[PDB]
Design a protein around this ligand. Structure first.
Ligand code: CL
Ligand code: CL
Ligand code: CL
Ligand code: CL
Ligand code: K
Ligand code: MG
Ligand code: MG
Ligand code: MG
Ligand code: MG
Ligand code: MG
Ligand code: MG
Ligand code: MG
Ligand code: MG
Ligand code: MG
Ligand code: MG
Ligand code: MG
Ligand code: MG
Ligand code: MG
Ligand code: MG
Ligand code: MG
Ligand code: MG
Ligand code: MG
Ligand code: MG
Ligand code: NA
Ligand code: NA
Ligand code: NA
Ligand code: NA
Ligand code: NA
Ligand code: NA
Ligand code: NA
Ligand code: NA
Ligand code: NA
Ligand code: NA
Ligand code: NA
Lengths: 92, 56, 237, 194
RNA sequence: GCUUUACUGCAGGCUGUCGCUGAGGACUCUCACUCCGGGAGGAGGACACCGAUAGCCGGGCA
RNA sequence: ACUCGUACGGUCACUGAAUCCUGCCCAGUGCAGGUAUCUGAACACCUCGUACAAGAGGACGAAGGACCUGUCAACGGCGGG
RNA sequence: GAAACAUCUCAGUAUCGGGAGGAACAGAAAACGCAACGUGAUGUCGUUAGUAACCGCGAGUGAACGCGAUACAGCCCAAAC
């Protein structure tokens, strides 16, 4: 479906309606220094590594919307519930 | 030839004999080893924890 | 499954061992200080149970009585010589350097003084081709060109008993008698005639290998069977 | 002023540099031709030996032992085993090489008792350690105030029960506080979790 | 019990790297080390073997 | 162990005396050779990060793979229209 | 056992190899860290506590300091000279 790049809506920070910019959430890079990372190294040994021997699941036929709504005046973003959408294109 | 009765006829070979060290008829005269006390194999006396129940 | 036959071999049990106690002599070249003043006389010609080929009993000047890997044409009374200055006649042993190029040779040493390793079976021979101060090129019975130290000793002539292979065994019994004199398990049951538990080719409602016969060099023992690292198979192309 | 001994010590801090390096490269050639346990008249590292209890006296013995480098020489499972217990290559023994060396020496001299030991280097495939053993029956030792303690009956086969310095450290008894909950007073009394 | 391109691992083989290991992206050498030689000595040589580790193959086996 | 052995050897497989013979197929799978280029781990090396370290990235690139070739008395195949 | 099963669990259990004593082992801090102007070798018992910690964060697993007790004990080298 189509969707406006910018539009007026509620900003939970400013606490009043203002022009927001919508952007798709870009994946942040992992550091490899989280607890789970240390547990992987620590607990992996001879033979099967339990949970660490598992491999990535599958895919749902359609994914939900993953967006960032940026307040055009205070510059602070907020998140919303996504909805299933095969494709999502921004208008402008 | 049947593996039972008919095969029992050729059994005239002496193997286990009275042991010099323990007195049991377990000294295998062909191997020169007592299957009961270990004579011929070890200076120490043959013994195992599995010869009795674990908590005993 | 169970260990395959090739694995049972390595354990060196009675069934797979050679009847060593029945063998005559370990055929190695004599050791000479230098000079070559070592000659002997052929006293007898005997059968070698380990090679199905004749061997010669020689009595050396210094009282040494030993069996020697006999080339064709050696007989009782003949005088054989071993050393640098040895005459260039059949049956004598001298380093490759003293041997004239183009002369058939047998019982060639791999490393000088090892007593001989190459070309020792019935009727075979190596061909000394090139000389040098550094290397003596010898063509082995397999057709391979082997670079050797000119100091490697060798015997002039082709190995005796040539043509042994020309006659067919004809019957199982003949093979049997020969096999009894070797370190080999015989007869041979085909893998495909066995049960799956006993061989990679065993099993099935009919007889056929359950996969391609060409096996990788890296295959582990118990699995390395069939055509080992075959560069090709068949006859065509 | 510096003791002469301090110089032997300082040399051994870096066995791959200076004169010591050349010494080791020469010695090991002879060592590799020697047996498993070789009694030697004098310690290669005098300072270390004296520091550990050695004395140029009757009943004090020194022997160099060579032990192979690496992990456990282990046989693969011949029956059912869960993946965790199927390993062979990465398994290492719980007793350090120095301790193995000490036991091999004590076995060679059944009447003697292990006092201590130290390293004298290694090549690519083996390590060498010199073990100081003591004759608990010789009167020159039974009368020594510093060594007579080793003559007591409860010190028999001390190396085999881990009562050696290398034994005690390897048993995790070094620390007296945190980390020694399952080591002191013994690995066995703690359920074998040390 | 058996099979395999089932899941997961484990031997084994191949290969890089570190240690043993030294002198002057291709090269020379000798001193460790290896092999031949009864010995003198010869061949090979910082490679190989061995110890450690990494990638690939791996129903041979669990 | 083979081996007191050395290619006229001995190991690993298939077929199964003699006689007349044994066609076509290398695409898939297997084995093997080659390979400009692509891909390809760790150590060491370079950049960033950290007064150090974790970590991120780069450069180089072995066997292997991609790719090319050989091979069926190698696994096997020899149809519809 | 986890109602399958691979890590986990059974369990450092069964069993195996080596060895001491009348008891073993431990033991006079490179400790503790109720953080202190504090405690003062080591075992063990009671408790701390199923607490902290671990764990397909599932099932399960699981201390310590301290405290109250028992009994109390503190020393010898290496080196300097
Ligand atoms: Cl989206
Ligand atoms: Cl034959
Ligand atoms: Cl002892
Ligand atoms: Cl306190
Ligand atoms: K289990
Ligand atoms: Mg693992
Ligand atoms: Mg029966
Ligand atoms: Mg021989
Ligand atoms: Mg034939
Ligand atoms: Mg036979
Ligand atoms: Mg057959
Ligand atoms: Mg059948
Ligand atoms: Mg099978
Ligand atoms: Mg058939
Ligand atoms: Mg067939
Ligand atoms: Mg206790
Ligand atoms: Mg040798
Ligand atoms: Mg299976
Ligand atoms: Mg269950
Ligand atoms: Mg569950
Ligand atoms: Mg537990
Ligand atoms: Mg604590
Ligand atoms: Mg004093
Ligand atoms: Na851990
Ligand atoms: Na088959
Ligand atoms: Na002893
Ligand atoms: Na532990
Ligand atoms: Na069954
Ligand atoms: Na094909
Ligand atoms: Na092909
Ligand atoms: Na269950
Ligand atoms: Na079940
Ligand atoms: Na777990
Ligand atoms: Na208190």
């Amino acid at each position: 479906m189509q969707m406006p790049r910018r539009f007026n809506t509620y900003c939970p920070h400013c606490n009043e309606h203002q022009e927001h910019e919508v952007e798709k959430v870009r994946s942040g890079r992992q550091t490899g220094m989280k607890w789970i990372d240390r547990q992987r190294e620590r607990n992996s040994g001879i033979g099967n590594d339990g949970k660490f021997s598992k491999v990535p699941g599958g895919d749902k036929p359609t994914k939900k919307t993953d967006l960032k709504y940026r307040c055009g005046e205070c510059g602070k973003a907020h998140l919303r519930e996504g909805w299933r959408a095969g494709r999502l294109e921004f208008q402008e | 030839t049947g593996a039972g009765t008919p095969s029992q006829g050729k059994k005239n070979t002496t193997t286990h004999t009275k042991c010099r060290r323990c007195g049991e008829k377990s000294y295998h005269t062909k191997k020169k080893v007592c299957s009961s006390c270990g004579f011929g194999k070890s200076a120490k006396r043959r013994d195992y924890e599995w010869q009795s129940k674990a908590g005993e | 499954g169970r260990r395959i036959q090739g694995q049972r071999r390595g354990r060196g049990t009675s069934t797979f061992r050679a009847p060593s106690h029945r063998y005559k002599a370990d055929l190695e070249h004599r050791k000479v200080e230098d000079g070559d003043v070592i000659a002997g006389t052929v006293v007898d010609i005997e059968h070698d149970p380990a090679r199905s080929a004749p061997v010669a009993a020689v009595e050396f000047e210094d009282g040494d009585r030993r069996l020697i890997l006999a080339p064709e044409g050696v007989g009782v009374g003949d005088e054989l010589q071993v050393g640098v200055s040895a005459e260039i006649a059949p049956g004598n042993t001298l380093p490759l350097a003293e041997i004239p190029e183009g002369v058939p040779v047998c019982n060639v040493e791999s490393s000088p003084g090892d007593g001989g390793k190459f070309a020792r079976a019935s009727g075979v021979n190596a061909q000394l081709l090139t000389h040098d101060r550094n290397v003596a090129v010898v063509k082995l019975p397999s057709g391979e060109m082997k670079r050797l130290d000119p100091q490697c000793r060798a015997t002039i002539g082709v190995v005796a008993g040539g043509g042994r292979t020309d006659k067919p065994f004809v019957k199982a019994g003949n093979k049997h008698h020969k096999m009894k004199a070797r370190g080999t398990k015989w007869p041979n049951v085909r893998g495909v005639a066995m049960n799956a538990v006993d061989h990679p080719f065993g099993g099935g409602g009919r007889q056929h290998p359950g996969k391609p016969k060409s096996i990788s060099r890296n295959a582990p023992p118990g699995r390395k069977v069939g055509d080992i690292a075959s560069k090709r198979t068949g006859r065509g192309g | 002023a510096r003791s002469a001994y301090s110089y032997i010590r300082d040399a051994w801090k870096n066995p791959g540099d200076g004169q010591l390096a050349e010494l080791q490269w020469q010695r090991q050639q002879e060592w590799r031709n020697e047996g498993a346990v070789e009694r030697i008249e004098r310690p290669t590292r005098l300072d270390k030996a004296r520091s550990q209890g050695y004395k140029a006296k009757q009943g004090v013995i020194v022997a160099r032992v060579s032990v192979r480098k690496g992990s456990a020489r282990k046989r693969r499972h011949k029956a059912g085993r869960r993946s965790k217990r199927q390993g062979v290559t990465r398994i290492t023994r719980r007793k350090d090489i120095q301790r193995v060396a000490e036991e091999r020496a004590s076995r060679t001299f059944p009447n003697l008792r292990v006092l201590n030991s130290y390293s004298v280097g290694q090549d690519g495939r083996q390590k060498w350690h010199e073990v100081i053993l003591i004759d608990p029956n010789h009167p020159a030792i039974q009368n020594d105030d510093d060594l007579s303690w080793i003559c007591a009956d409860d010190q028999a086969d001390r190396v085999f029960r881990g009562l050696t310095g290398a034994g005690r450290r390897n048993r995790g008894l070094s620390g007296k506080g945190k980390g020694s909950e399952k080591t002191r007073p013994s690995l066995r009394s703690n359920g074998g979790k040390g």
